[PDB]
Design a protein around this ligand. Sequence first.
Ligand SMILES: Nc1nc2cc(Br)ccc2o1
Lengths: 8, 273
Amino acid sequence: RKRRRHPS
Amino acid sequence: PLESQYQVGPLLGSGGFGSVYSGIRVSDNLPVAIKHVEKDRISDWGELPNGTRVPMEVVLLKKVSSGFSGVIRLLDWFERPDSFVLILERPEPVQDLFDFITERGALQEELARSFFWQVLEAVRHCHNCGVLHRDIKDENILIDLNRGELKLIDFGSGALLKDTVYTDFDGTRVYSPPEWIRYHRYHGRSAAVWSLGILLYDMVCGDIPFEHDEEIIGGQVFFRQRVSSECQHLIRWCLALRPSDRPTFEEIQNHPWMQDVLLPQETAEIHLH
Ligand SMILES: Nc1nc2cc(Br)ccc2o1
């Protein structure tokens, strides 16, 4: 399962 | 003078922290991180204790950087024609908690407990200093791998702490609380507690629970990894849909799951070295 950062 | 007081090295993290460069304070060879913020890009401004107009980020950093804490401290700052330059501590060696969790997967609960505790203490420090971070997430936490100490970074979405309602938000949406998604209104402390529930799930499950607005406001928490009943209870309490149903920081730290925390040096020796 993909895991990603999220922008502010 | 900036270039005359610091040796400036290369970009840190390839821009992933912002315009942050490695540096060394010439006067004592102290390692520093040098962060640049463009005036044109600054949405929120504040006044220093002496009335000087500076980015809110500098205001908040200065407020939390007195004394020792689990926050990367602002050591100095400079104004340039088109930017502000921030001199920060640079612990070494470091890995941010997002990369740490990606590489190691879901953390053992003993390790998550130690990390989460240190994050609670650092957020309490910020609040006690009058500062609301508003962007608590694993990407904004550095691990000092040798000392086992966690450090909060990036107050660029923060605000002065107030007890009245907030109607603005520029932090990370998947860590933001349902009352923000639904009503664009939140109070600082209960919104922080929500983000801490997201962070704790992230630590013990290996990734955050919600990716979509419907999941944030839906109120169902599915556990994708084995997590103790006491830990599930704390997470679900922090992620109560109504803000008044969430624990206070005192209630989080008195929770049964949080007892018998490791010390930072014990954490490093057991889990990080
Ligand atoms: N080693 C190290 N990486 C850092 C990133 C930021 Br942002 C601030 C300080 C740091 O120290």
